[PDB]
Amino acid sequence: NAMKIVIAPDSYKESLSALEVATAIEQGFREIWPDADYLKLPLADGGEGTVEAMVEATAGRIVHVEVTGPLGHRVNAFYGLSGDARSAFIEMAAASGLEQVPPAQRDPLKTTSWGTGELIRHALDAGVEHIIIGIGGSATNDGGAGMVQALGARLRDAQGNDIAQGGIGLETLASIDISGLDKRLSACHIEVACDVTNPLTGKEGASAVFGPQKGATPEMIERLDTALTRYAHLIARDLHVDVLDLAGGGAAGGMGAALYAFCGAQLRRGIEIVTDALHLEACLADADLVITGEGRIDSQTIHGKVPIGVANIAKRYNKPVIGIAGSLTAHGLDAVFSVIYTICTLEDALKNASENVRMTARNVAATLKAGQQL
Amino acid sequence: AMKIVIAPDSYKESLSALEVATAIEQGFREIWPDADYLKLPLADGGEGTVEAMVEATAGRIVHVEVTGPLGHRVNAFYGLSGDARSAFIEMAAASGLEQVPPAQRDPLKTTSWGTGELIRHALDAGVEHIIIGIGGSATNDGGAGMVQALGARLRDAQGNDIAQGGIGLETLASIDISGLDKRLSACHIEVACDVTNPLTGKEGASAVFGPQKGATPEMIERLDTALTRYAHLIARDLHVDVLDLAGGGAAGGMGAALYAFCGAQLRRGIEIVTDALHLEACLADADLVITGEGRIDSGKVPIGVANIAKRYNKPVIGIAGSLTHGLDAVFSVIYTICTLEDALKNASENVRMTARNVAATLKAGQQLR
Numbered sequence: 102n103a104m105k106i107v108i109a110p111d112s113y114k115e116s117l118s119a120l121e122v123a124t125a126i127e128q129g130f131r132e133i134w135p136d137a138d139y140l141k142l143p144l145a146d147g148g149e150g151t152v153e154a155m156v157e158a159t160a161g162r163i164v165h166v167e168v169t170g171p172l173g174h175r176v177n178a179f180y181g182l183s184g185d186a187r188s189a190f191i192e193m194a195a196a197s198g199l200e201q202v203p204p205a206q207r208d209p210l211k212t213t214s215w216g217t218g219e220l221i222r223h224a225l226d227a228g229v230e231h232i233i234i235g236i237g238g239s240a241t242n243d244g245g246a247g248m249v250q251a252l253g254a255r256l257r258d259a260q261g262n263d264i265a266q267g268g269i270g271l272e273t274l275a276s277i278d279i280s281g282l283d284k285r286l287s288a289c290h291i292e293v294a295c296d297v298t299n300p301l302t303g304k305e306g307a308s309a310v311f312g313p314q315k316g317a318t319p320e321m322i323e324r325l326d327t328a329l330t331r332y333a334h335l336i337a338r339d340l341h342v343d344v345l346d347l348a349g350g351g352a353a354g355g356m357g358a359a360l361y362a363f364c365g366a367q368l369r370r371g372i373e374i375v376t377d378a379l380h381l382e383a384c385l386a387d388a389d390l391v392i393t394g395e396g397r398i399d400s401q402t403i404h405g406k407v408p409i410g411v412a413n414i415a416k417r418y419n420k421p422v423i424g425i426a427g428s429l430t431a432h433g434l435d436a437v438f439s440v441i442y443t444i445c446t447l448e449d450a451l452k453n454a455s456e457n458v459r460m461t462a463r464n465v466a467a468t469l470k471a472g473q474q475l
Numbered sequence: 476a477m478k479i480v481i482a483p484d485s486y487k488e489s490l491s492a493l494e495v496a497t498a499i500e501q502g503f504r505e506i507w508p509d510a511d512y513l514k515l516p517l518a519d520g521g522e523g524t525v526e527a528m529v530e531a532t533a534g535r536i537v538h539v540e541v542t543g544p545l546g547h548r549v550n551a552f553y554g555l556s557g558d559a560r561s562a563f564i565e566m567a568a569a570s571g572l573e574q575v576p577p578a579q580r581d582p583l584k585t586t587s588w589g590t591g592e593l594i595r596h597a598l599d600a601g602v603e604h605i606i607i608g609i610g611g612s613a614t615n616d617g618g619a620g621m622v623q624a625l626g627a628r629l630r631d632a633q634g635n636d637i638a639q640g641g642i643g644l645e646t647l648a649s650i651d652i653s654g655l656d657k658r659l660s661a662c663h664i665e666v667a668c669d670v671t672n673p674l675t676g677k678e679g680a681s682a683v684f685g686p687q688k689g690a691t692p693e694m695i696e697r698l699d700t701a702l703t704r705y706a707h708l709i710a711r712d713l714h715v716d717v718l719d720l721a722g723g724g725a726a727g728g729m730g731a732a733l734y735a736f737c738g739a740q741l742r743r744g745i746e747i748v749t750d751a752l753h754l755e756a757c758l759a760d761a762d763l764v765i766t767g768e769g770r771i772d773s774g775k776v777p778i779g780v781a782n783i784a785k786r787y788n789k790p791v792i793g794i795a796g797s798l799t800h801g802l803d804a805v806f807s808v809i810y811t812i813c814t815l816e817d818a819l820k821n822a823s824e825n826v827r828m829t830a831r832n833v834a835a836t837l838k839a840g841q842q843l844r
């Protein structure tokens with residue numbers, strides 16, 4: 102009988118995690134409806150915070166582990182494992198991301214994805230049947246060549262020499278050999294959060310569109326673009342997979358195409374991966390009311406990926422859905438209310454972000470109650 | 476049909492009470508097109524009370540020229556009701572601090588003559604009822620200019636009409652209300668008065684409100700002596716104790732002169748406006764009350780509304796503007812001052828969108844069984 106209220110928000114970036122957002126909403130709602138049946142389900146879009154969100158949702162753990170970082174030195178990375186141990190959650194950026202690289206050291210000719218392969222290997226080592234991988238924020242333009250080598254593939258040059266680390270090495274590539282390739286991979290269900298359509302090569306390929314932001318000069322870009330062409334050609338030829346035409350294969354320096362061609366990964370929109378994995382639809386089918394939201398700081402990246410995906414599912418069950426949306430200044434949702442917040446370089450500001458979500462949530466609930474009485 | 480009353484105050488430096496009410500109704504109609512809406516722009520007796528009352532009563536604004544606070548000609552205004560039975564006056568239009576540049580602020584010289592004129596013109600339209608707000612005064616003359624403009628003869632020891640301003644009060648020797656417009660006692664005159672301060676003393680007009688009107692400490696002492704006298708002469712010649720009036724110090728002592736000379740009632744501004752628009756009958760009949768206000772600083776209207784509403788067990792939601800008790804829920808809108816080109820438009824849009832989401836939320840709650 103108790104009213105069932107599902108609270109499935111994204112994070113407020115640079116401030117509250119998805120779960121802290123859900124918790125502040127629940128506290129506000131409980132001021133009006135102390136005895137409702139609340140189900141919190143912290144969501145993510147496959148980007149930053151996905152591993153933590155997934156681990157919370159699944160009662161899992163974060164496993165910290167030393168891997169090879171993007172410049173080939175030892176870095177501390179992490180992956181997540183589900184409560185049941187059947188799923189691993191990986192953000193490649195922990196091993197191979199731009200922020201593992203101090204500004205006066207970005208060379209996308211040298212940077213490697215090796216440590217992403219190590220994270221995948223450790224996940225596989227833990228017995229998982231399912232891996233979810235986020236590939237945003239990459240330092241690498243090596244087409245995932247480091248990654249697949251770390252997993253057992255031999256990527257050699259014309260004289261049988263393993264290729265050099267980074268995109269540099271891919272120019273020299275003569276034979277892909279997957280006799281050594283970790284056999285647990287094709288048995289595994291591997292999903293990659295991929296929200297771009299860019300292919301491996303060309304004028305909207307990996308090097309052209311994303312190489313600049315990893316520090317490629319105009320000329321470095323042609324070299325890498327020309328090398329990923331060869332890569333695709335040696336992929337089609339030595340793996341018998343066509344990767345040149347794949348939508349999203351140009352993601353994370355071409356790692357999208359390596360994850361597809363070597364690992365049997367599926368490239369899917371991240372919100373759909375996360376939505377399926379946490380069984381949102383099953384949680385919602387029952388609900389009376391769905392509350393969601395998200396917070397963005399930068400106005401370019403204000404994309405309601407989580408609220409809209411939540412609303413799309415809810416509408417199939419005709420559930421009312423209300424969003425509490427965070428912004429610096431102030432789509433299937435029945436209503437959206439805004440919360441102004443800032444970047445948390447006080448922690449006092451973390452508390453104020455918490456308080457403003459809670460208080461808005463209170464007023465939303467009070468207004469729902471007022472509606473009942475009409 | 477659902478009855479929805481929209482009864483907000485203005486957003487200061489932004490949307491008028493009516494413009495708030497219009498933005499709210501627009502957003503609500505996006506969810507509930509066919510409900511019954513009533514916009515009642517409200518005011519607390521302060522800035523914007525004449526304009527809100529005209530709108531709320533389908534009346535009109537009358538522009539007329541009067542004597543400003545330093546004696547010069549100013550274009551003041553007032554409001555008549557739709558039935559032409561009530562006048563709405565803001566003193567400040569005639570005798571306000573906005574009419575006096577900061578450099579030229581002298582509470583020894585400033586006159587309320589202009590205010591008396593406004594009142595005379597309202598009496599001239601045969602109104603039975605006058606609502607006067609007395610905020611933002613430049614004057615510390617005890618309403619002496621005002622009443623002299625209404626025919627009261629206030630003169631020194633030689634029969635000479637006293638000079639303009641509270642400095643004229645130092646020589647006041649006799650009050651004669653024989654020329655005093657006979658239409659005043661007849662008139663139901665209500666004065667928005669929301670401070671308890673009396674005419675004279677430590678918490679009197681001059682001590683408490685003088686300084687902001689340019690009163691120096693030395694000036695404050697002169698004026699307080701002169702108003703103390705005025706007060707004694709009022710008791711002697713009009714047989715009325717203004718010396719003990721809560722609110723007599725309002726508007727440099729104008730509250731006491733409206734009480735004593737005019738027969739006016741001093742009431743809380745919100746309580747005058749309530750009765751005038753029959754807010755209690757509108758609300759008793761409503762299903763749903765929406766209110767609000769906007770402030771630029773660090774709310775009598777929303778609380779006044781919610782207090783009535785809750786008496787009839789009506790849901791009340793506020794939509795509150797800003798730059799950075801009895802309500803079921805309140806939601807905030809950020810606005811900017813309206814000197815920027817799109818500031819008014821953006822504020823109106825933000826109110827509208829918020830109201831839509833309030834309406835949509837109320838609707839979802841309806842279907843929560």
Ligand SMILES: [Cl-]
Pocket residue numbers: 169170171172173174175176201
């Ligand atoms: Cl490194």
